[PDB]
Every structure is written in structure tokens, then in C-alpha cells.
From a paper:
2,3-BPG is a natural allosteric effector of hemoglobin (Hb) that is responsible for decreasing the affinity of Hb for oxygen to facilitate tissue oxygenation. [name] is a multifunctional enzyme, functioning as a 2,3-BPG synthase, a 2,3-BPG phosphatase and a phosphoglycerate mutase. The phosphatase activity is responsible for the hydrolysis of 2,3-BPG to 3-phosphoglycerate (3-PGA), an intermediate in the main glycolytic pathway.
The crystal structure of [name] complexed with 3-PGA and 2-PG has been determined to 2.25 Å resolution. The B factor of 3-PGA in monomer A is 39.0 Å2, that of 2-PG in monomer B is 63.9 Å2 and that of 2-PG in the dimer interface is 56.3 Å2, consistent with the weakest ligand density being observed in monomer B, and likely suggesting different affinities for the ligands at these binding sites. The 3-PGA phosphoryl O atoms interact with the guanidino groups of Arg100 (2.7–2.9 Å), Arg116 (2.7 Å) and Arg117 (2.9 Å), the amide of Asn190 (3.2 Å) and the hydroxyl of Tyr92 (2.6 Å). Also, unlike monomer A, the side chains of several other amino acids located in the active-site pocket of monomer B, including Arg100, Arg116 and Arg117, were highly disordered, as shown by weak or missing electron density. The phosphate O atoms form direct hydrogen-bond interactions with the imidazole of His65 (3.3 Å) in monomer A and the carboxyl of Glu72 (3.6 Å) in monomer B. In addition, the carboxyl group of 2-PG makes water-mediated interactions with the imidazole group of His65 in monomer B and the carboxyl of Glu72 in monomer A.
Numbering used by the authors:
A (entry chain A): 2 to 254
B (entry chain B): 3 to 241
The structure:
């Protein structure tokens, strides 16, 4: 049969205000990020969505986004399942740096390639990074399918897809085949990776997809779990276009 | 041996209005949330590190788990919810004023409905102002027993009988694997698991009083029987 699922990326926290690369640092939502989640929830309630399962990353800003949506829906009882495989892209040594400053030191166009291209890998994160130990000693990164030493230290979009797709295949997609209505609370680049796979977007074209924060993304799938058309945003068409331009402008002088 | 943490949510409006929530999905109030928040601060100050949490399907129990996990910075820990941890089903008593009931049917009878071990209250009926808010909710259309087979009132003993399979089948096997587990549940449903784990009689269980917002530690052996009486963690509270 036809299938329908919602994906979204969370709203803003402090480092978004400061225009810093956040990636695997576990920054909390701020007050307006929490409101963005509630607005998604209200939108989803206005369309009478009834979720059967929620999938999230292990970064708390994506879990809190999911809890906030469920509360607006009166669906706090719906199962939630979290995996590092949905984490934001690991940005290596760019973690914590200002974007517009990078665009100064290397050009607007080196920055765009670092952020949106499919294949270029960021400089790895090194033991001298102020947040190295906070990331890799965190107990949430033990309980899994990969030894702590084989966790990544930086990721291209391609690397994201390769550790994300096994989770889609083994956990998410079988529930979709089952007929359940699913919510994915993830991140900018882990959602771009999933969209690239489901929509058959080229290595070249994925560069041009920028996802707005805190906005529901409706995806329709066919009986082979491929997209029927392009992903669609729920909410006002202009306000969303302005919101996309914002994320694009973080990397511009 | 084994360590287990159980606890009970804080208050909402109806617990101030001296009323029966039961299976009605009443929300925490401000102190109800801050109580869970303070309770999470106390488990953090005790360096607690959970691997799995279990709740009922009522939001007062789920928010409580969520606020606690936020205080702990442990929001990534798996949560699992189940009606089998629900508060006791108070039947037709649901929603009624406690005092107004005391003048309708008498001190001694209302007291026996609330404190006994073996007495089933009057069933809730489709005329009840909250019958449809409960049995039409989608969270029961998707549970492990048919909707009609779910109870319309429960003795405290019925609570244990519906809880024990979930404990035997779902929870205890994870206690055995070495996981530090949290159970965010309700007064009655926590009373039934204690009675089972400690071995309390149908007589002592009726007088056991469990405070809200307080981590309740239970130490077990490999047969998962209590090594001693349940203990409260933290300090300085009354009533």
C-alpha cells in the first residue's frame, strides 16, 4: 500500500544563536527551540496525526523535541526509540567554530562545500578539542553495535548515510511496512541523508537541499519504500522559504 | 545482588480537589512537576545511572520519568510504558469528590474501598461522565488484551494480578541482566509490586504508606526477593 511518515529537525539552542557548528555536542534546546517543537505539535494535531512510534537520535535536543510534540498531541504513551545512527553529522574539528567566520577565513564557497556536499570529509576531531572527552566518554555511546574506538571522528554526508541506512532498513522501514504511522525527530544532515536515499537524489543535487528548523516534513512512499514525489513541508509556504534562506545565510558574509 | 528504584508521581489539580483520578489522564500541576524535578536532582546527587525506565500509560507517570531523565542528563535511556502499571481502576468512584462520597455512602464504606486489599469498588458504567474518555482512548486499542477484557473496576488485589505478568515477563528479566531500572508508577501499582517482592501480607499491605516524589530503593537477591524492607533515599520530608 501507500505509506506516509513525518520527519523533522529540531529548533534552536544557544550555539544556533552564536552561529556555531553543533554536531555531536549535546547542546540543549533554548526557549524558542522548545516553542518550535510545540508549534510542530500543534500543526500535527491540527492535521489529526496519530503516531504509533517515534524515532530520535541520542542527542537530547532531538528527544526533547519529540517529547514536546507528543505532549501537544496527548500521545505521551507512544513508544520512543533512540539511536546514535540518527545523530547529526559529525563535523570533526569544525565543531564549536563560527560559520560566518569560517566563510571569512576560507570563502563563502569552501563553507558551502563543507556543509552541503555529499563527499567531502571534515578535518577529524583531535584529542585537543575542548569537547573531545565529553563526547567520546559519554555512557550513551557504549550500549551499541560498534566499539567506542570505531565511532567516527568526522563524517561526510556519505558516511552519515552509511551508518544511518542500516537503522532505517532494520528498524524504521519494517514498521512502515507494518502500517504504522511514524515520526522521525532528527537533524539537518541526518535527515538530508535519509531524504537522499528515499528520493534517489544525486550526489550533485543533494547539495541544494537545505532543511528548515522545526518544520514537519511529509514523505509519501510506494510499496517498495521509495518516495512518490518530493518531500513537502507542512506550514506556510513563504515563512518556510524565508526560514530556508536563513540557514543558507549562516555561511555567507 | 540487585538494586531497583521505584517511585510515585507528584500531585495535580484533582489531588488538590481531593478526588479520584484513577485511569483518567490527569496532568501534573506545577508542584507535581517540580517534585519530579527535585526527585531527579536527588538521584543525580546520588550519582544514579539508569539503563531502562518503565512507566504506566498515564501521562502523570510519563512526564515524571521525563523530568527525572532531564535532571539526570539521561534522556537517551530507553523508556517503556504499559497499562499494567496504571493506577488502580476505581470504577464508578472515578471523578467523584471524596468527601461528597463520604456523605453519600458513609465514612466506613469509602474507607474500605480505598484501604482494603480484596474489595472491588462499583464498576464504572457507560453513563459515567468519564467512561468514554477512557475506553475510547487509542492507547488501549493497541494493548496486549482486548478492550472489552480490560477491567471496569479493580481491587488492590486485582492490581497485583495484572501487574505481575508484566513484572515476570518484561521487567524481572532485565533486572537479572544487570540493568539499573527505574519504575515510575502510581501509589497502588507500586504497593502491589512491593507486596510481591517483600512478601507483605494482605494485612500489612493495607497500612503501608508510600510518599510521592521520593526514590524508593529495593534490594533483591538472585531469586529477586527483597533482602530487606524498602528504603527511601534523600532525607528530611514529613507526612
Amino acid at each position: 500500500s501507500k505509506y506516509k511518515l513525518i520527519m523533522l529537525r529540531h529548533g534552536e539552542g544557544a550555539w544556533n544563536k552564536e552561529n556555531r557548528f553543533c554536531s555531536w555536542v549535546d547542546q540543549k534546546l533554548n526557549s524558542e527551540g522548545m516553542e518550535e517543537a510545540r508549534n510542530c505539535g500543534k500543526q500535527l494535531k491540527a492535521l489529526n496525526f496519530e503516531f504509533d512510534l517515534v524515532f530520535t537520535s541520542v542527542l537530547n535536543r532531538s528527544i526533547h523535541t519529540a517529547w514536546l510534540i507528543l505532549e501537544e498531541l496527548g500521545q505521551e504513551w507512544v513508544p520512543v526509540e533512540s539511536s546514535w545512527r540518527l545523530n547529526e553529522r559529525h563535523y570533526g574539528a569544525l565543531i564549536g567554530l563560527n560559520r560566518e567566520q569560517m566563510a571569512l577565513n576560507h570563502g563563502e564557497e569552501q563553507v558551502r562545500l563543507w556543509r552541503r556536499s555529499y563527499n567531502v570529509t571534515p578535518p577529524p576531531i583531535e584529542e585537543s578539542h575542548p569537547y573531545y572527552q565529553e563526547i567520546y566518554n559519554d555512557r550513551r555511546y557504549k550500549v551499541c553495535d560498534v566499539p567506542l574506538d570505531q565511532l567516527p571522528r568526522s563524517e561526510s554526508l556519505k558516511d552519515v548515510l552509511e551508518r544511518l541506512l542500516p537503522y532505517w532498513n532494520e528498524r524504521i522501514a519494517p514498521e512502515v511496512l507494518r502500517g504504522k504511522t511514524i515520526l522521525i525527530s532528527a537533524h539537518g544532515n541526518s535527515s538530508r541523508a535519509l531524504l537522499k536515499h528515499l528520493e534517489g537524489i544525486s550526489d550533485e543535487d543533494i547539495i541544494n537541499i537545505t532543511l528548515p528548523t522545526g518544520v514537519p516534513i511529509l514523505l509519501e512512499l510506494d510499496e517498495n519504500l521509495r518516495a512518490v514525489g518530493p518531500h513537502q513541508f507542512l506550514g506556510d509556504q513563504e515563512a518556510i522559504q524565508a526560514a530556508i534562506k536563513k540557514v543558507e545565510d549562516q555561511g555567507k558574509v
